[PDB]
Assembly symmetry: C3
Homo-oligomer: 120 residues x 3
């Protein structure tokens, strides 16, 4: 099983434990099956850091010119107003580049596992 | 006759036949003339379905790994107060991918026709 | 080789409303340098468009002004195409694509001093 496509659908406000935002991703799997999953920016950023660590060549850690993994701004750079809308635009681009990568990365178990529906 | 570039400019309320949103495309033709056209999301989605059926190979209908036509979430996936915004980001991606495809598809009459200025 | 100083990536972060000297919107870009350092810069759309026009003048071949089919410099809509109450928001998708395409151009262009200068931090 693998993912064919990820579309960023939007965000929603949540309030427990306190006010934050969750980004909604429409995940289409190999069998045309379709699921919406909900992730915080910080969780996505931790996912991205690990992805870079797993793929140093494609991360640009050896020759920076061979980098193909997309850039993702750290949380700190989304300061005040419009943080949700700002991060939404950034993630839409991040997701399309991510899914355009060679299958070595775009189907790695780290990615598949991040975007699988979480337990109730 | 053909399209060099399409840019998504935003969205606006139309009132005919009643209240809805329309997405604005700045269309640049071969002679560098630029025209804005106005299309509702449903109309774009119908364009996208038809394009797929016209191009089974490139749509991934014969062999899924050979697909190059971009993915577009169904209308049902967009609701809530930010539906119009949420579709905006999705359409920016779809279009750029759309005009990067070979001229068999990026210049097919079905596409040209779609982005031509409609009759008054 | 374009010297010891250049940009690896530019990301559009978003926009902010400014009130001085009067009501306008600036766009915030996160600029990553050769040493992987990152700075935020603030630029109004009119400034971006002038930068764009100058870029095209400097590189006629790559701007498709000789041969339209050889164009690699990205397209950018003129300021008059953005108006109404979502003008600020509406320019984002355009600017996001502009930035990524820019940074994928051959170094002769993507690290030309004009571009490098436009995205450097301005004096206080």
């Amino acid at each position: 099983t693998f993912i064919r496509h990820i579309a960023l659908l939007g965000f929603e406000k949540r309030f427990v434990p306190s006010q934050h935002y969750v980004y909604m991703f429409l995940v289409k799997w190999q069998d045309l099956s379709e699921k919406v999953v909900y992730r915080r920016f910080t969780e996505i950023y931790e996912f991205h850091k690990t992805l870079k660590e797993m793929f140093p060549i494609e991360a640009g850690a050896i020759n920076p010119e061979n980098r193909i993994i997309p850039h993702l701004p750290a949380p700190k750079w989304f300061d005040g107003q419009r943080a949700a809308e700002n991060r939404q635009g950034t993630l839409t681009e991040y997701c399309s580049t991510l899914m355009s990568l060679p299958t070595k990365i775009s189907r790695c178990p780290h990615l598949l596992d991040f975007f699988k529906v979480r337990p109730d």
